[PDB]
Structure formats: structure tokens, C-alpha cells
């Protein structure tokens, strides 16, 4: 008989299976549609989630109860040092989909990216790309032949880039290598851009700008095996329930005489690939710019790094992307920031945000001070120093 009281199902069947992602770096499964009139540019970027903080800004939203008023907003900081271009892949269209025709690599690959090709780097003889780099012996005839093939074919061009983890506080030391689609016309010009940028760095400001809507693609934080109550949000069973209450009472009707795929079951929670869209960039800050965390309203000469450092991450010393709100993945995780797949004109996008103040109080507690100078000014002289 019927359910006797209607209620929406628990969870989204489109995010199935709730299994562990096959990689710690979530795949970009779609790049922006290519507009072959614009200049050649990366469609995405690689960064590392540093942490969260809060900003204050005046809201520019006519008709709102908070128009021209100050609002406090959570922001996520993504450490984004320049990525190194080390390769270029050509993709030909086939009746079976896109197929990589060939890949041309840079002549010199740094140990950062060479470590990606090894499970035991320290005891290896580090032979990776040693025979390939000889293809640049005298004139690079083989390299130019492969690039000519990419131009003659390969309706889609993607560059191979890798992060510079040595510039992050992470202990990993093994770089993240990814394909980023080159948008901007003239497949020939895409290949020329890739070849010229071989062994060269691309900074995050050449890809993203202030107020832009971007998408964050990352593997969520892992939580291991989870019961249905927190994995799917099902109702806790009553206290009187024998055999436990963090369960789904009826996992199926008599017929079909099978548990169905749509029934909440205990299993892995977290560590899933997610692609969350429409996160507005609030800052495109630069590592070389001391007073990274300053605004035109604050002027306090401070970097984005909170007092004591980003908890479990470290200090931001590179270029960084501050997006509004939160993004999937935990701190220290590699994230991919990609340009929006559509042209959003909604007055939520297209809003020009100007930060008034960025919180740099310690996130290791109820941080009361923005700067060590401010802590000294409030507390006066202490016994050890100050």
C-alpha cells in the first residue's frame, strides 16, 4: 500500500555511486565552449586550498534591504602559484569521441613534475624523459614534426601544466600535472602558444580576474564508512528501536525481491569528485605583494595569511585566489578552478565587489588581533618581550 505520508527522497541519485574518487585530483569533465576569436588562454588553473577567512564589503544590490550596507562574507583562499607549461596534447574528433593523437613535451622537465612519474623517486635512476629530451638534439625535427601533426589534426588543443608544490608549504614535493584546454582560436595559434610557453610559467592573473564567476572542481573531504543517518540524512529511528536506530527501517518492499539501488545504504561518505559552479572571485592577490590582505579602506600592511598561519596549511607566499563562500575539498587539497561554462548575467554575477577588510586574526582559536603590531598595541609590554 502507498507510503501513507509523502516526503521527498533522501539524497540526490545523480551523485551516485557514493564511492571514493579514482584520483585525489578531480577531473575537469567539461571545458568552456571555445570562442575562436579571443586570444589563446588557459580555461582553468590548478591551486591548493589553503583555508577560509571572512571579509567585509559594501553590498551593491539595488532593491535589497542591504543595498550599500556592509556585509560579512566567508571566503575560501586558494594558493595559486604559477603553473609550469611542460606539454601539449592534440585531440582529434572521431565517431567514438575525442582521441589524443599525440603529446609533445617540453625539453626540460623539473624534478617537481618528474616526481609525478615515479612511485619510488629516491631510489630510482630518474631516467624519465631522458631519451625524449634528445629529440631536441640539433634542430628539434621530431618535435616540430609532432607539433605540425597537432596543427594538421587535433581539433582540440590542451596544454600539460604542473603545479609548483615547492612554492607551497605542503610537504608533498610531487607536483600535480593536468591537461588544461586552450581556448582562443586558430588551432595553429594554440599550438604556437603551447610551444612558446614550454618550460614557462603561467600566472593565475592571466587566467582569472576580479568579480569573475568560476567553478571549483575537487575531491571532497573523506569520512570513511558512514551509516545511512549521516550519509543520506535519513530519519533517526526511535529510541525504543531494537538492533539500533541509525538505520533505514524498511530497505524494500517484498517485491521486487531485491534491495533497490535507490535505497539508502551505509557506505563510503566523502572523497567524491564535485564540480561546484558560480563562485565569485573576490581577490586575485599576488605573493610578491606585501599588504596582500590590505584594502583601500583598511591600508594595514598585512598579507592574506592569518596570525599564526592558515591552520594545517601554512602561510600564503604565492599568488592566490580568494573566492566567495566555500568550495569542495579540504585544506592542502589540489583544486581545479575553471572558467564558467556559460555567460552569467544575473546581477549576482556582474557585481563588482570591493573588499573593505579581510580578517587575519588567528584561526587557531578565538583570535582577537589582526596583526602582531595590533596585539602589541593592545596588550602593552609583556615579560618575555614587547
Amino acid at each position: 500500500s502507498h507510503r501513507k505520508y509523502e516526503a521527498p527522497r533522501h539524497g540526490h541519485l545523480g551523485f551516485l555511486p557514493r564511492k571514493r574518487a579514482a584520483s585525489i585530483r578531480a577531473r575537469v569533465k567539461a571545458f568552456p565552449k571555445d570562442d575562436r576569436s579571443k586570444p589563446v588562454a588557459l580555461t582553468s588553473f590548478l591551486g591548493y586550498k589553503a583555508g577560509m577567512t571572512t571579509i567585509v564589503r559594501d553590498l551593491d544590490r539595488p532593491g535589497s534591504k542591504f543595498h550599500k550596507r556592509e556585509v560579512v562574507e566567508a571566503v575560501t583562499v586558494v594558493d595559486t602559484p604559477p603553473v609550469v607549461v611542460v606539454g601539449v596534447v592534440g585531440y582529434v574528433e572521431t565517431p567514438r569521441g575525442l582521441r589524443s593523437l599525440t603529446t609533445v613535451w617540453a625539453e626540460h622537465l623539473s624534478d617537481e613534475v618528474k616526481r609525478r612519474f615515479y612511485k619510488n623517486w629516491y631510489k630510482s635512476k630518474k631516467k624519465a624523459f631522458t631519451k625524449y629530451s634528445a629529440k631536441y638534439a640539433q634542430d628539434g625535427a621530431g618535435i616540430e614534426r609532432e607539433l605540425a601533426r597537432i596543427k594538421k589534426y587535433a581539433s582540440v588543443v590542451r596544454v600539460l601544466v604542473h603545479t609548483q608544490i615547492r612554492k607551497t608549504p605542503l610537504a608533498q614535493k610531487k607536483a600535480h600535472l593536468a591537461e588544461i584546454q586552450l581556448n582562443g582560436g586558430s588551432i595553429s595559434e594554440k599550438v604556437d602558444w603551447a610551444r612558446e610557453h614550454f618550460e614557462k610559467t603561467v600566472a593565475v592573473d592571466s587566467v582569472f580576474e576580479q568579480n569573475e564567476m568560476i567553478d571549483a572542481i575537487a575531491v571532497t573531504k573523506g569520512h570513511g564508512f558512514e551509516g545511512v543517518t549521516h550519509r543520506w540524512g535519513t530519519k533517526k529511528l526511535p529510541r525504543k528501536t531494537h538492533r539500533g536506530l541509525r538505520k533505514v527501517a524498511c530497505i524494500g518492499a517484498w517485491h521486487p525481491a531485491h534491495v533497490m539501488w535507490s535505497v539508502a545504504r551505509a557506505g563510503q561518505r566523502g572523497y567524491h569528485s564535485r564540480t561546484s559552479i558560480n563562485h565569485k572571485i573576490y581577490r586575485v592577490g599576488k605573493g610578491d605583494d606585501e599588504a596582500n590582505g590590505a584594502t583601500s579602506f583598511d591600508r594595514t600592511k598585512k598579507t592574506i595569511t592569518p596570525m599564526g598561519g592558515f591552520v594545517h596549511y601554512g602561510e600564503i607566499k604565492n599568488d592566490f585566489i580568494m573566492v566567495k563562500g566555500c568550495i569542495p575539498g579540504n585544506r592542502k587539497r589540489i583544486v581545479t578552478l575553471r572558467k564558467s561554462l556559460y555567460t552569467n548575467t544575473s546581477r549576482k554575477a556582474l557585481e563588482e565587489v570591493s573588499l573593505k577588510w579581510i580578517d587575519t586574526a588567528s584561526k587557531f582559536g578565538k583570535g582577537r588581533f589582526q596583526t602582531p603590531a595590533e596585539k602589541h598595541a593592545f596588550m602593552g609590554t609583556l615579560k618575555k618581550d614587547l
Binding site: 505520508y5 509523502e6 516526503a7 521527498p8 571572512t54 567585509v56 553590498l59 534591504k65 542591504f66 550596507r69 556592509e70 556585509v71 560579512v72 530519519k235
Partner: protein
């Protein structure tokens, strides 16, 4: 007309009557504008219009359903300027379905969101947040 406020007054909550209508408290029996979800209690927040009964107060006010407006919450809610705030108690005022107050004065402070939402409450208010 008002941003989301943390719901602090589920059905069955008794708040103090802040007006001078002769009611001493309001017993929430319903919340206007509330949605539906299995097992979920309708819950009021500051500025909400509720259906209530007077449990203690004038007998001509008791034993009947009447509209009321929550003017103090006591459950912490976050304003858009980042301020988490709360009152010392939960309090509402008796009104008609149009938002006009039955009484003519408010005792205690009134939430700014409720004051913006209901002008008659604002007109009869004293301190606003």
C-alpha cells in the same frame, strides 16, 4: 521582505506578550508562510506572523485563535552584517491578519527585522534592537 532568520519558536512554544492588550503570553499553534515537511514542526522567527492562543491573560482574549507577530526571539540569529544576536526572551504581540496591533504599546525592545516588516508594530515600538 526579510532575510532568513534562525527559527527559534516551533509550534507549542509560549512567548511573552509584549503588548498591552491584556494577554500575558502567546502559545504558538501555527506559523504563517511556513512550508511543509514530514515531522517538521512549523517554527517562527523574529518578524514572523503566527497563529496563537492566549494561555494566561484576559478571559475575553483566552480560548481563541488570533494572529500574532514575533518581536523578540532569544534564539541566536545571524544578521547579514555578520552579527549573531539574540534577545533575553521570546516575545510577540497580538495583531489582526493585516499586521495591525490589537494593543497600543510594546514593552521591551523589538527586533529591527520585525520593525521593518510590520509598520504598526514599529509605530507602537520603543527601542528597536
Amino acid at each position: 521582505t526579510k532575510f532568513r532568520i534562525s527559527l527559534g519558536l516551533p509550534v507549542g512554544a509560549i512567548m511573552n506578550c509584549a503588548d498591552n492588550s491584556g494577554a500575558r503570553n502567546l502559545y504558538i499553534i501555527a506559523v504563517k508562510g511556513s512550508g511543509s515537511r514530514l515531522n517538521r514542526l512549523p517554527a517562527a522567527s523574529l518578524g514572523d506572523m503566527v497563529m496563537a492562543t492566549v494561555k494566561k491573560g484576559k478571559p475575553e482574549l483566552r480560548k481563541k485563535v488570533m494572529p500574532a507577530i514575533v518581536v523578540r526571539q532569544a534564539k541566536s540569529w545571524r544578521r547579514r552584517d555578520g552579527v549573531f544576536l539574540y534577545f533575553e526572551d521570546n516575545a510577540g504581540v497580538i495583531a489582526n491578519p493585516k499586521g495591525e496591533m490589537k494593543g497600543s504599546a510594546i514593552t521591551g525592545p523589538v527586533g529591527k527585522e520585525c520593525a521593518d516588516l510590520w509598520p504598526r508594530v514599529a509605530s507602537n515600538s520603543g527601542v528597536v534592537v
